[PDB]
From a paper:
Ricin consists of a toxic subunit, known as the A chain (RTA), and a subunit that binds galactose and N-acetylgalactosamine, known as the B chain (RTB)3. RTA has a molecular mass of 30 kDa and exhibits RNA N-glycosidase activity, which inactivates ribosomes by removing the A4324 in the sarcin-ricin loop of 28 S rRNA4. Eukaryotic ribosomal P stalk proteins have been proven to be essential for RTA binding and rRNA depurination. A distinctive feature of P stalk proteins is that they contain a highly conserved set of 11 residues (SDDDMGFGLFD) at the C-terminal tail of P2 that recruits elongation factors and interacts with several RIPs, such as trichosanthin and Shiga toxin 11415.
To promote a more efficient interaction between RTA and the synthetic C10-P2 peptide, we constructed a chimeric protein in which C10-P2 was fused to the C-terminus of RTA using four consecutive Gly-Ser (GS) repeats as a linker. Finally, we determined the structure of the RTA-C10-P2 fusion protein at a resolution of 1.5 Å. For the C10-P2 peptide, only 6 residues (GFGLFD) could be fitted to the observed electron density; these residues corresponded to Gly110-Asp115 of the human P2 protein. The 4 N-terminal residues (DDDM) were disordered and did not seem to contribute to RTA binding. As shown in Fig. 2 (A,B), the C-terminus of C10-P2 is coiled into a short helix that binds in a pocket formed by α6, α7, α8, β7 and β8 of RTA. The root mean square deviation (RMSD) of the overall main chain of the RTA moiety in RTA-C10-P2 and wild-type RTA is 0.290 Å for 222 comparable Cα atoms, indicating that the binding of C10-P2 does not substantially affect the structure of RTA. The Gly110 and Gly112 residues of P2 accommodate the required backbone dihedral angles to facilitate the insertion of Phe111, Leu113 and Phe114 into a hydrophobic pocket formed by the Tyr183, Arg235, Phe240 and Ile251 residues of RTA. The main-chain carbonyl of Phe114 in P2 forms a hydrogen bond with the main-chain amide of Arg235 in RTA, and the side-chain atom OD1 of Asp115 in P2 forms another hydrogen bond with the side-chain atom NE of Arg235 in RTA. When these 16 residues form a β-strand, the length of this strand is predicted to be 56 Å, which is much longer than 29 Å. Based on the above considerations, we believe that the linker may adopt a flexible conformation of sufficient length and thus does not disturb the interaction between the P2 peptide and RTA.
Author numbering:
A (entry chain A): 5 to 263
B (entry chain B): 110 to 115
Amino acid sequence: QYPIINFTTAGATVQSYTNFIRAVRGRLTTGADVRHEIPVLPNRVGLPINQRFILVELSNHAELSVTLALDVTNAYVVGYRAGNSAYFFHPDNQEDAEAITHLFTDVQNRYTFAFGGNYDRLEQLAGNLRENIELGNGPLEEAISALYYYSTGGTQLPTLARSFIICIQMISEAARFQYIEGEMRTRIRYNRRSAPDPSVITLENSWGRLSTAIQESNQGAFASPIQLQRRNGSKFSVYDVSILIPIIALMVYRCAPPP
Amino acid sequence: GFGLFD
């Protein structure tokens, strides 16, 4: 079985959430590849199937549990299991379609959605943009329930899509970015639920580009600046990896490190 | 080092 990390929203604290995100990062990366102090996820090329996924078992105060599957190559959610049913996002290619056959192999009912898990598509289905979907422990608690009840007709598709958006940001994006982990820690600390501000949204949108810019940099210096947003929506440019070391925790593999 | 975004 793939590695399993457990988290519950029931009585969650800053520390329990922090322990969780740190454990997820530890199972996503091996320590083999660290560039400018930033870990790089395993290269998909040649990655054995037995090392391809990790599992995040989420429980809530309602005593419901679901298990998300994350791809180690990008830290993103590929599907989930609840009881006797499992659901997978539409795969991008045949290799990924084959790979997900190795997940939740004893589940009685397996389904693949016709839609992918990218935000553009999930927002369309949810009927809301990320800027209008609240995040926090309550939202996560609710998301777990919604995912749990999908197979029995209890959850409408827009609510399912919204629930994925919540889970992906609070787990995948938090694993990818200390900054986003921090944003979720704050919501937990004060029991606040609020939508992500522009700084969070723009970081999420830029993860792939930041990964490439860092890995292809000249001694850390970007050939082309990357524009991000502040919390108030104002734009600024990033010219160097240095300022991102406290912000980005994981990068997708883009190229081999230079000699 | 999050002051970057404030």
